[PDB]
Amino acid sequence: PRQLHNTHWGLVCPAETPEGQACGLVKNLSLMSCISVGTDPMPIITFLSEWGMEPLEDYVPHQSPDATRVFVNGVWHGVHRNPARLMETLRTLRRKGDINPEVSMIRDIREKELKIFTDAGRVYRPLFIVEDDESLGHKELKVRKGHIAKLMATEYQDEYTWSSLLNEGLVEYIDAEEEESILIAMQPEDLEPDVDPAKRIRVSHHATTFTHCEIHPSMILGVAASIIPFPDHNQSP
Amino acid sequence: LEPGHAADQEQAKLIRSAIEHTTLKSVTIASEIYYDPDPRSTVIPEDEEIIQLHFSLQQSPWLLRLELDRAAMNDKDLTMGQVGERIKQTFKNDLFVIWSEDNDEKLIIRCRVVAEEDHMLKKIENTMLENITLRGVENIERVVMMK
Amino acid sequence: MTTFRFCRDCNNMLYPREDKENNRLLFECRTCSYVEEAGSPLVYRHELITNIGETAGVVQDIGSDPTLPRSDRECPKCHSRENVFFQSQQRRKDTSMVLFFVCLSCSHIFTSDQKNKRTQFS
Amino acid sequence: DGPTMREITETIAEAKKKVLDVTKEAQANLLTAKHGMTLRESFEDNVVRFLNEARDKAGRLAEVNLKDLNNVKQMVMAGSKGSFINIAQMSACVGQQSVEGKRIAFGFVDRTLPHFSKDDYSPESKGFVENSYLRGLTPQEFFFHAMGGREGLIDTAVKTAETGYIQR
Amino acid sequence: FEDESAPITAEDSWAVISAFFREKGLVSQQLDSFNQFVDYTLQDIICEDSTLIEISFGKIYVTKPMVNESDGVTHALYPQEARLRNLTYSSGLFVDVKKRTYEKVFIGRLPIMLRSKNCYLSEATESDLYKLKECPFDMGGYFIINGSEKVLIAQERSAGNIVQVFKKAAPSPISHVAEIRSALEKGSRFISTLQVKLYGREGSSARTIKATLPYIKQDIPIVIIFRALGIIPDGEILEHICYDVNDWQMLEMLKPCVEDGFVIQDRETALDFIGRRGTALGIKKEKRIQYAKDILQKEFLPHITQLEGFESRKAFFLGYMINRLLLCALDRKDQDDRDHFGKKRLDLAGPLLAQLFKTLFKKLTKDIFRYMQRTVELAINAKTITSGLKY
Ligand SMILES: [Zn+2]
Ligand SMILES: [Zn+2]
């Protein structure tokens, strides 16, 4: 427990923990972390059977092995052949607003399982959605200069808000569980397909599969570390 | 090592494999049980040359076949005869054991109990793979050489 | 590889039995009185050095998995270069680091183990 | 020195080539494990040696370059605060992070962070911090180093709690 | 003129972040949790067990923060005053009882989290706040009790309703365990733990698999459970566990399981088997078989269903656990990581304040049912809740 687990990324500050006996056990949420407040799973379950989910009662393994298992809040509700379309529809419904943004949906392609969570207590963060709906080239972030323009245009009048971004499917909330099934780009510039001998060295992008992008890496910190100047130049302890 | 042979990569290895505990499990690739009724002919083709050679200078119809691995067999300085005669001196007359010679391309060990002619064997396999010691001392697993 | 059979009537597991006269292998049921000859003489198998499980996960959608790395090698079948690869799906400390590839065109699995010894990888 | 930095960066790049060759060797199954040792253990053993070897040699290059005027080098010569490892990490490469004697573990499934691809056994993937303190760590190098660091804070609390009892 | 469909740059990120913090602030965690409690959770706790053997509770109302005065009218309470006068920043907790003869009402007090929907400051402008002697920089995700500001620290705990297989210590007779802690969101949280253990270590005479049912003083071989569920044929049982007819290795691990439940060949014999391991020697079969049916329908995997017609749902889930267990035992998977934050949950004001309110609503419920059993011919201890929370 006291160890800084890999999954703590972006959810809990990697620096702020009390020294001594509470070291590692007492933690601090990073700046953009949030917790699931809990949502009713009835509708999703309904939509699932409406979209081809076979009831467990009428399930026969030796008759459909490739079938994907569908779980909701830990309950195995059924099976589904071709989970690709369900997963697509499910993501669209959430990026639209039909499915509460707080809900986590994880498809385990290799494990043949599709898990959904609507319960409370899950720590999540918002990421930049990365798709290829744009024809002009490769994969790009859904947000653009136009979007940010409105944002500030609203920041100046003190209406485009954070929820706007969510409603328009530009940003998503991701808990540690769903985090398992994606690939995140660190800098928004890691999408673009003789360096300054002063800058820090970085590893070249060997992926054209990005599903999301970090809004900003400094948000892995909590309120306290968030006040340290050039923390990336200090010895960890 | 002894005062004289302390600078021999070989005198060490010899002593290594002689101390490092070794069980059949570390040598066996897979153990199988067959219904091979005729102690002469065999449903298993590859096992004909081994029984044919056992008529030169009681038994249950059930067979326990072990397919050893040459890599470990020689890496731990072990001979088929050694392995076999050890298993033999472990189960007494209670078990009938025969094995393929070191020359053959496949190292096989076939055993027969000598009606519950099934459960015993599935236990015999267990005892062989783990309880029987082929070479080495008890409690000594890893054994590394250094200079 | 001991694919065992169940009863034709009650679907309960069948057990091996010896025909003490014609010396052959049978499989009866302990519920009813069903019985039958055996397909093979192999009644038990124990693999100490196992391979099965290293392929688990290869599905018709394995390519749509964004977390997997992609190489541009050539598959012995369609020669295409749309590859996705992963290490052994087993979870043994004594596992190798051999890579398994999956052609995204014909879904053919090919390994990089220069000491290749298996025919189907299944 | 600007030239020293070019010698340091190349020293590190050289190490990343060695690791890359052992990986190919391991992925081809040409690499053989020493007696009483796993294939993966020999592999890890070699990558960590390559990387520490790299940090160390890259460190010397930084030290040799500093003049007798360099105050850091001065405190070290007098024996009042500072040592090699210090110059080496501040000026040149920080080094390989570790937790429980191994490189950072695959805490997510087959990956150290959601930002990497599955089955990536490279040095950047499992905690090698190429950068120095002067240059600044990348967000991944930062988190990895914080995992290494945390282990120290905890071990210190234990070392502090346990020794106190032994002393009595 | 700056095509609105142009890519974004690193600097453009802070714009997006400012938007985030403009909408949520820095303690949305406190507000959102507590707000869900007051708005939904609360009303959902009054309806559960809202009937006594009649009196049925209905709608709930939540007053603004007020004070219990001595020698005076009830007063509207403001934070700056609760801190100073050492008062408690709480609010009314009314209900809506329905007294029906079957052979508004003020109840308790709820302390309010500053800046929650129910708090005055929530709407206060920058100016209104100044007049109220409250700093406009105050974030407000806490409570005021007896004059001191109290914060509820997030309590971390493992998630519930998640299957987890774990290896074990060499000495123990059990080598692997598949665990899950089932619990319900509404009504109550009966955390009855189910354990699917794999007896015997690598290399023992017939490794068997047994499950741990609540109130049953003995582990029951899995095959028997499947039959108490109506799945009798070995073929069908194994089919609910192993979803691959060619997986001779897994099926081989279940062989000793089949032999372990060979004696029982029907649902009744199965139920009676289970019934006895949880009943005295003098109880009649009918009562035994009944006992077992209730245990499997209420204390066995309750997160799935607790109604009647759902034995196939629990059978497949039990098989799924067995499947996961062996999967680890066959070395095809590693034992689950108990440190994965994805399977962790943090309990905040709302959830925490719910366990208490539930526990108190049931104590208040007992104080009302007693005003009926002892009654032969409003008698509600409101403080049962007020000081229960405050405390
Ligand atoms: Zn039958
Ligand atoms: Zn191909």
Q: Which of the ligands is closest to the CA of residue E265?
A: 1
Residue A87 CA, ligand 2 centroid: distance in Å: 27
Is C78 assigned a ligand-binding role in the annotation?
yes
D21, D119, D126, best to mutate vs chain C, most C CBs in 10 Å = D119
Closest CA to D146 of E316, B79, A225: A225
Closest CA to C96 of D126, D32, E327: D32
Instruction: Judge whether A102 and A37 are in contact, CB under 8 Å.
Output: yes
- Find all residues with CB under 8 Å of D101, minimum gap 6, and list them: none
Closest CA to A117 of A12, A35, A28: A35
Residue A119 CA, ligand 1 centroid: distance in Å: 46
What DSSP state is assigned to residue B131?
I
Nearest residue of B to residue D37, measured between CA atoms: B142
E32 residue type, one letter: D
Q: What 3 state SS string does chain A have?
A: CCCCCHHHCCCECCCCCCCHHHECCECCECCCCEECCCCCCHHHHHHHHHCCCEEHHHCCHHHCCCCEEEEECCEEEEEECCHHHHHHHHHHHHHHCCCCCCCEEEEECCCCEEEEECCCCCEEEEEEEEECCCCCCCCEECCCHHHHHHHHHHHHCCCCCHHHHHHCCCEEEEEHHHHCCCCEECCHHHHCCCCCCCCCCCCCCCCCCCCEECCCHHHHCCCCHHHCCCHHHCCCC
Instruction: Judge whether E357 and E40 are in contact, CB under 8 Å.
Output: no
Q: Are strands A212-213 and A184-185 parallel, antiparallel or unpaired?
A: parallel
Q: DSSP states of E112-174 as a string? A: PPTTSTTSGGGT--HHHHHHTT--TT----SEEETTEEE--PPEEEE-SS--EEEE--TTSSE
Q: Are residues E70 and E178 in the same domain?
A: no
Would you state the structure tokens that stand for residue B45, as one six-digit string? 């083709």
Interface of E with D in 275-294 (CB under 8 A): none
Q: Are A198 and D135 in contact (CB < 8 Å)?
A: yes
Evaluate whether the domain defined by D1-138 bears CATH number 1.10.132.30.
yes
Is C10 assigned a ligand-binding role in the annotation?
yes
Q: What angle do CA D72, D75, D80 make, to 5 degrees?
A: 140
Provide the residue count of chain E.
391
Is C30 assigned a ligand-binding role in the annotation?
no
Q: Please name the helix (run of DSSP H) or strand (run of DSSP E) that holds residue E94, with its range, or none.
A: strand E90-94
Name the residue range of residue E115's domain. 28-140+349-391
Would you state the structure tokens that stand for residue C51, as one six-digit string? 């391979």
A66 residue type, one letter: D
- For chain E, say whether B126 makes contact (Cβ under 8 Å): yes
Which pairs count as long-range contacts for A76-80, CB under 8 Å and 24+ apart, including other chains? Answer: A76/E304, A76/E313, A76/E316, A76/E317, A76/E320, A77/A45, A77/A48, A77/A53, A78/A48, A78/A49, A78/A53, A78/A54, A79/A53, A79/A54, A80/A48, A80/A52, A80/A53, A80/A54, A80/A114
The C-alpha R_g of chain B, in whole angstroms, comes to: 17
With 0-12 CB in 10 A as exposed, 13-18 as middle and 19+ as buried, what is A200? middle
CATH (one of 3.40.50.11600, 2.20.25.10, 3.40.50.280, 3.20.20.60) for C47-122:
2.20.25.10
Domain residues of chain C, as ranges? 1-46, 47-122
Q: Are A74 and E156 in contact (CB < 8 Å)?
A: no
Is C104 assigned a ligand-binding role in the annotation?
no
Sign of CA dihedral D27, D33, D38, D41: negative
Separation in Å, CA E193 to CA B100, E177, E190: 53, 12, 9
Compute the distance between CA of residue D101 and CA of residue D99 in angstroms, rounded to an integer: 5
Q: Do chains B and A touch (3 or more CB pairs under 8 A)?
A: no
Interface of E with B in 186-225 (CB under 8 A): 203-205
Q: Please name the helix (run of DSSP H) or strand (run of DSSP E) that holds residue B13, with its range, or none.
A: helix B9-19
Compute the distance between CA of residue E328 and CA of residue E321 in angstroms, rounded to an integer: 11
Question: What is the layout of strands, in order, in the sheet containing C35-37?
Answer: C15-19, C24-28, C35-37
Q: What angle do CA E132, E136, E140 make, to 5 degrees?
A: 90
Compute the distance between CA of residue B109 and CA of residue E104 in angstroms, rounded to an integer: 88
With beta carbons under 8 A apart, name residues in chain C contacting A183: 66-67
Task: For helices E12-24 and A145-156, give the axis angle rounded to 10 degrees.
Answer: 50
B-E contacts at Cβ under 8 angstroms: 6
Q: Are C6 and E235 in contact (CB < 8 Å)?
A: yes
Instruction: Judge whether D44 and D22 are in contact, CB under 8 Å.
Output: no
Looking at the complex, report in whole angstroms how far the Cα of residue B123 sits from the nearest Cα belonging to chain E. 7
B-D contacts at Cβ under 8 angstroms: 10
With beta carbons under 8 A apart, name residues in chain A contacting E4: 144-147, 149
Residue E250 CA, ligand 1 centroid: distance in Å: 23
* Cross-chain CB nearest to D115 (options A20, A186, A236): A186
Q: Are residues E356 and E330 in the same domain?
A: no
- For tokens 């207590």, the residue is A121
Sign of CA dihedral D13, D17, D22, D24: positive
Q: What 3 state SS string does chain D have?
A: CHHHHHHHHHHHHHHHHHHHHHHHHHHHCCCCCCCCCCHHHHHHHHHHHHHHHHHHHHHHHHHHHCCCCCHHHHHHHHCCCCCHHHHHHHHCCCEECCECCECCCCCECCECCCCCCCCCCCCCCCCEECCCCCCCCCHHHHHHHHHHHHHHHHHHHHHHHHHHHHHC
- Find all residues with CB under 8 Å of B3, minimum gap 6, and list them: none
- For tokens 């294939």, the residue is D39
- For chain C, say whether B117 makes contact (Cβ under 8 Å): yes
The whole-angstrom distance between residue A39's C-alpha and the CA centroid of its chain comes to 18
Question: What is the layout of strands, in order, in the sheet containing E209-212?
Answer: E164-167, E174-181, E193-199, E209-212, E220-221
Q: What angle do CA A150, A153, A155 make, to 5 degrees?
A: 115
With 0-12 CB in 10 A as exposed, 13-18 as middle and 19+ as buried, what is E347? buried
Would you state the structure tokens that stand for residue D145, as one six-digit string? 């180093």
Is C119 assigned a ligand-binding role in the annotation?
no
Whichever domain contains B70, its CATH number is 3.30.1360.140
Which chains form contacts with chain B, at 3 or more CB pairs under 8 Å? C, D, E
Provide the residue count of chain C.
122
Classify domain C1-46 at the CATH class level.
mainly beta
Compute the distance between CA of residue B59 and CA of residue B33 in angstroms, rounded to an integer: 14
With beta carbons under 8 A apart, name residues in chain E contacting A57: 312-313
Looking at the complex, report in whole angstroms how far the Cα of residue C44 sits from the nearest Cα belonging to chain B. 5
Q: Are B32 and C42 in contact (CB < 8 Å)?
A: yes
Which residues make up the environment of ion ligand 1, defined by Cβ < 5 Å?
A: C 7, 9-10, 29, 31-32, 34
* Cross-chain CB nearest to D38 (options C85, C94, C114): C94
Looking at the complex, report in whole angstroms how far the Cα of residue C23 sits from the nearest Cα belonging to chain D. 47
Compute the distance between CA of residue A75 and CA of residue C1 in angstroms, rounded to an integer: 34
- For chain C, say whether A183 makes contact (Cβ under 8 Å): yes
Query: What phi, psi does E122 have (nearest 5°)?
Result: -50, -40
Largest CA distance in chain A: 65
Q: What 3 state SS string does chain C have?
A: CCCCCECCCCCCECEEEEECCCCEEEEECCCCCCEEECCCCEEEEEECCCCCCCCCCCCCCHHHCCCCCCCCCCCCCCCCCCEEEEECCCCCCCCCCCEEEEECCCCCEEECCCCCCCCCCC
Q: Are C95 and D40 in contact (CB < 8 Å)?
A: yes
- For chain B, say whether D36 makes contact (Cβ under 8 Å): yes
* Cross-chain CB nearest to C90 (options E238, E252, E331): E331
Instruction: Judge whether E207 and E200 are in contact, CB under 8 Å.
Output: yes
Largest CA distance in chain D: 56
Q: Are E29 and A75 in contact (CB < 8 Å)?
A: no
With beta carbons under 8 A apart, name residues in chain E contacting A18: none
Name the residue range of residue B47's domain. 22-136
Would you state the structure tokens that stand for residue D92, as one six-digit string? 């040149």
Grouping H, G, I as helix, E, B as strand and the rest as coil, residue B94 is helix
Compute the distance between CA of residue E229 and CA of residue E304 in angstroms, rounded to an integer: 15
Is C16 assigned a ligand-binding role in the annotation?
no
Q: What 3 state SS string does E179-240 have?
A: EEECCCCCCCCCCCEEEEEEECCCCCCCCCEEEECCCCCCCEEHHHHHHHCCCCCHHHHHHH
Q: Are A109 and C56 in contact (CB < 8 Å)?
A: no
Q: Å resolution of this model?
A: 2.3
Looking at the complex, report in whole angstroms how far the Cα of residue C81 sits from the nearest Cα belonging to chain B. 36
With beta carbons under 8 A apart, name residues in chain C contacting B31: 45-46, 48
Compute the distance between CA of residue E228 and CA of residue E251 in angstroms, rounded to an integer: 21
Q: Are A186 and D117 in contact (CB < 8 Å)?
A: no
Is C106 assigned a ligand-binding role in the annotation?
yes
Classify domain A38-119 at the CATH class level.
alpha beta
- For chain B, say whether C49 makes contact (Cβ under 8 Å): yes
Q: What 3 state SS string does A153-203 have?
A: HHHHCCCCCHHHHHHCCCEEEEEHHHHCCCCEECCHHHHCCCCCCCCCCCC
With 0-12 CB in 10 A as exposed, 13-18 as middle and 19+ as buried, what is E20? buried
Is C88 assigned a ligand-binding role in the annotation?
no
- For chain B, say whether D114 makes contact (Cβ under 8 Å): no
Compute the distance between CA of residue E20 and CA of residue E18 in angstroms, rounded to an integer: 5
Would you state the structure tokens that stand for residue D146, as one six-digit string? 């914080």
* Cross-chain CB nearest to A3 (options D2, D112, D150): D150
Instruction: Judge whether E41 and E74 are in contact, CB under 8 Å.
Output: no
Q: Are residues E85 and E192 in the same domain?
A: no
Compute the distance between CA of residue C45 and CA of residue E174 in angstroms, rounded to an integer: 24
Compute the distance between CA of residue E26 and CA of residue E326 in angstroms, rounded to an integer: 46
